[PDB]
RNA sequence: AUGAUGAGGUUAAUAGGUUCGAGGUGGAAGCAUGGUGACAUGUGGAGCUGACGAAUACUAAUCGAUCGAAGACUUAAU
RNA sequence: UGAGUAGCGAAAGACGGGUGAGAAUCCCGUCCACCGAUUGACUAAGGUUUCCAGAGGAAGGCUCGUCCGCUCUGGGUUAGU
RNA sequence: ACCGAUAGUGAACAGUACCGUGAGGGAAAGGUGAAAAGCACCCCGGAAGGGGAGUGAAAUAGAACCUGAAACCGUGUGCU
RNA sequence: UUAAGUUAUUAAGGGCGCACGGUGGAUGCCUUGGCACUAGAAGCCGAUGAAGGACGUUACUAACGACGAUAUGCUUUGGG
């Protein structure tokens, strides 16, 4: 089977969250685990977190082992922006865009 | 630079305001033409 | 030798606190480029040390800056006569060493290589 | 100064072919703890 | 510039602390003697010394992981 | 799109301890540095609650933030001269 | 044989945000469901968010809530 | 075996087709608000203090409506 997590408005933007996450898709767990503890990145720490959640619901719900499984996959969407400006010279200002992401992390065991 | 719009509160009230408005014909006219508009500040 | 972002006399400055606060605690954290510079500096004065006359006792004022160490048993005493104290007295058979670097993750803030600097 | 024409979704993609990050040394902490940064040492969290 | 290139990774002289030199400066501190004193002389080509030459495993180059071939057909001589 | 590009607004910081899910950036200590006919201390204009205590960390703060002139709750200005 | 949210009043929620010393100029912003029955309880997480369970005819109707086009941004693949 | 010759295999990335998502708020359906008129009244108040406002008033109180220290209302005659 299949389970998954979602984070949803990260506070991130998608260019930056994409650059980590084509790290580890296609991995088994624990290795994506210690790939993430020792990126520096910004983006690991809350990647780590929706994968965990992701593993979490896996045993929990599903009763999986997770001793075998896989990041089946793994990607970033679009949030919505916040739009924001800030001042140039002779009187000009110019537009500045906080971008956000959501996060999708699916785990499989590979059987059916 | 020193710019324009240099505050001060008496200066204001006294150019500006309601008393000043009400000494003319003109500021009359001034006042009544905010009244039929509907404007919530009357000098 | 390396500049490390500072002019020359701020260089000298960081160096000698750097190289005084390692004598008071014997383990201190910083970065990998300070470590590797303040490793030079602080052996020069333990060897300065194991000398012990007074010539030398004056050399090794003109680094070490000035502080008060409060041991047990209600001791004080400056950071000068702690290195010609037990530090000298410590290494008295090493011929040269008394200090090794242990290499930890990058900080968050920014990248920067952090670093334990010890005293053997 | 300015760029002539616009860029097309094709060679924008062609120019970020090496825009990639690698993944670290990680050597793992045989005596007690996961993986670590090679040439690291972790006091904690490892015994090496 | 980065990457690349080259010297090394304990069965080790790669950095280079320690010891000894080259070169540079030019006579340390402390003490003694002379002088009313500023100072001078002796101990003593003294002391100090980044990058240059040697020697020495004392400190660090740990343990590890990844990638990487399996020699096709047709024809003619052999 | 240009592009992970230009910029992040004059300057000296270092280390120890603490708190926290998280610390170059918050609190405490020592050392160091800068101004000093002033970057010190008073009174006016002008602003109008920005003042204080406890709690908070979505947005604001050109980074971070456990902090704040920001958010929440409750307080604070006393004249015969 | 008038409009139907860029229309119709500037204004379906306003002569208000805001701009200007002043006279004056002057916006944007409608729709859960028949009924709030608006998600008890469990799990990961500091939280935010999420996965289950439940309500409902329907939750890819969960409040940024009818339908949900295009530009634009991604993930996987058949041929090259 | 050696010669001479022909033709295969790679996808760092890219192209086309298809599937599945996000962003965004067009389109359809809807109406709380407007627009143009017809018929019948009426048009203008004020020193007995106006038009328009400022401050207040609810057990808990920010805004709008209502009201005025008798204040989120008092009396009376009818309706219900
Ligand atoms: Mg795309």
Do not use: W
């Not at chain 1, 980590?20 to 503890?37: P, S, Y």
């Amino acid at each position: 089977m299949e389970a998954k997590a979602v984070a949803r408005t990260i506070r991130i933007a998608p260019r930056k969250v994409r650059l980590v996450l084509d790290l580890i898709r296609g991995k088994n767990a624990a290795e994506a685990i210690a790939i993430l503890k020792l990126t520096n990145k910004a983006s690991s720490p809350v990647i780590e977190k929706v994968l965990m959640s992701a593993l979490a619901n896996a045993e929990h719900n599903y009763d999986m082992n997770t001793d075998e499984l896989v990041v089946k996959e793994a990607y970033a969407n679009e949030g919505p922006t916040l739009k924001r400006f800030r001042p140039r010279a002779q009187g000009r200002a110019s537009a500045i865009n906080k971008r956000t992401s959501h996060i999708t992390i699916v785990v499989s065991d590979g059987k059916e | 630079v020193k710019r324009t719009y240099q505050p001060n509160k008496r200066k204001h009230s006294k150019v500006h305001g309601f008393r000043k408005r009400m000494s003319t014909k003109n500021g009359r006219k001034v006042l009544a033409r905010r009244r039929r508009k509907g404007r919530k500040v009357l000098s | 030798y390396r500049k490390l972002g500072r002019t020359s006399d701020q260089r000298k400055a960081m160096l000698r606190d750097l190289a005084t606060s390692l004598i008071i605690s014997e383990r201190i954290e910083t970065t990998e480029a300070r470590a590797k510079e303040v490793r030079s500096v602080v052996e020069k004065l333990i060897t300065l040390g194991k000398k012990g006359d007074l010539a030398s006792r004056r050399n090794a004022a003109k680094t070490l800056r000035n502080v008060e160490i409060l041991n047990e048993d209600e001791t004080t005493q400056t950071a000068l006569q702690k290195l010609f104290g037990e530090i000298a007295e410590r290494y008295t058979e090493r011929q040269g060493g008394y200090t090794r670097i242990l290499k930890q993750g990058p900080r968050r803030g920014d990248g920067a290589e952090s670093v334990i600097i010890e005293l053997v | 100064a300015v760029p002539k024409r616009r860029t097309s979704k094709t060679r924008k993609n062609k120019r970020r072919t090496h825009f990639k990050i690698s993944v670290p040394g990680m050597t793992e902490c045989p005596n007690c703890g996961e993986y670590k940064l090679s040439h690291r040492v972790c006091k904690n969290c490892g015994s090496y």
